[PDB]
């Protein structure tokens, strides 16, 4: 049984401008097995209107998925991606950093 820990990247589809609508993405890759919990958070609360890609995998058989939601960034609002997987002691929360 191969166990792979998910790599997590939180980021916007287009460069972020406060007040201009965009997409917030959470890309989880390199994990195994496929069961995985992915949530997008706004100010700590989960976002309902989220879509996701069809499960696929890389040359090494590890899985990847894209979760994405429409949003309008602001100066104050904090976004994050919450991810849970058997390889994790506790859920991992990765904050969005626009200035990365």
């Amino acid at each position: 049984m191969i166990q792979r820990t998910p790599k997590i990247q939180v980021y916007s589809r287009h460069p972020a401008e406060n007040g201009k609508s965009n997409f917030l993405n959470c890309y989880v890759s390199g994990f195994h097995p496929s069961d995985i919990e992915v949530d997008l958070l706004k100010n700590g609360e989960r976002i309902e209107k989220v879509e996701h890609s069809d499960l696929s995998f890389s040359k090494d058989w590890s899985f990847y998925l894209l979760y994405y939601t429409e949003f309008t960034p602001t100066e104050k609002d904090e976004y994050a991606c919450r991810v849970n997987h058997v390889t994790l002691s506790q859920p991992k929360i990765v904050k969005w950093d626009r200035d990365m």
Binding site: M1, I2, R4, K7, Q9, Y11, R13, H14, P15, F23, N25, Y27, S29, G30, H32, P33, S34, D35, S53, D54, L55, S56, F57, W61, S62, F63, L66, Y68, D99, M100
Partner: protein, 275 residues
């Protein structure tokens, strides 16, 4: 340039919870165009690209039949593989299958693939000569013998060298506008203090298609692995891709470093320096 068509199938057993999950996706290069999900409403093969929508019901009915069979086969497989390894019906297990063809710039056949994985590792794969099998272990050896007796390799060769290629050509034509496009990366750099003697330089490549790309850091014009970070190429969600490469540097030495960018949308490689 060169092109490829690939189909990916994932089957996951759900012990005590009913039938296995079955997901299938088809890609041309880095663009997905079809999907099947056992958990969704239609129970049909669905289009995921504009240029496949034009296909008639004959196409959709047939591909729906086909993928459902793939599903049935994997369902039997999961039972078989559990026996091969004498596993309990407590654990969930995974079957993965990937096949497809590559064509060169002349759109002529180049390479064929048919690979099978159990629980995230190689199980059995068709070799490049499309006449022989690589088996991961003695359980896979049983399967190998089955597929040699049933001459599966020869059946696959026909598909990979014929049907697979011929249809890839057809998608490339009908989806010319998107599939034959080349979006060159938009590049820029960022700088962050890490201590008061170190700083991170991050090289950004955005809005590019296809996804194949190379980001290298040079220092005084010489390649530099060492303190360098390369993230997995990621989808923007609009058909384009993103990637960055970073390096940690002594403050005051930022100008020693250059990020180099290679992509087929770029006539000549880009060289970036801080500011």
């Amino acid at each position: 340039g060169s092109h490829s068509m690939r189909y990916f199938f994932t089957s996951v057993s759900r012990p005590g919870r009913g039938e296995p999950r079955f997901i299938a996706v088809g890609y041309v290069d880095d663009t997905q165009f079809v999907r099947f999900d056992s958990d969704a409403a239609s129970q049909r093969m669905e289009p995921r690209a504009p240029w496949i929508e034009q296909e008639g019901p004959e196409y959709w009915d047939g591909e729906t039949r086909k993928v459902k069979a793939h599903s049935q086969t994997h369902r039997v497989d999961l039972g078989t593989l559990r026996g091969y390894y004498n596993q309990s019906e407590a654990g969930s297990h995974t079957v993965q299958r990937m096949y497809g063809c590559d064509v060169g710039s002349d759109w002529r056949f180049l390479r064929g693939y048919h690979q099978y994985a159990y629980d995230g590792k190689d199980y059995i794969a068709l070799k490049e000569d499309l006449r022989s099998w690589t088996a991961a272990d003695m359980a896979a050896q049983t399967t190998k013998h089955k597929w040699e007796a049933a001459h599966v390799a020869e059946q696959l060769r026909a598909y990979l060298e014929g049907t697979c290629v011929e249809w890839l050509r057809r998608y490339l034509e009908n989806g010319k506008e998107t599939l034959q496009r080349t979006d060159a990366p938009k590049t820029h750099m960022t700088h962050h203090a890490v201590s008061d003697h170190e700083a991170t330089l991050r090289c950004w490549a955005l809005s590019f298609y296809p996804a194949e790309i190379t980001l290298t850091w040079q220092r005084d014009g010489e390649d530099q692995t060492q303190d360098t970070e390369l993230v997995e190429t990621r989808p923007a969600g609009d058909g384009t891709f993103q990637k960055w490469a970073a390096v940690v540097v002594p403050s005051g030495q930022e100008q020693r470093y250059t990020c180099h960018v290679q992509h087929e949308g770029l006539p000549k490689p880009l060289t970036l320096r801080w500011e």
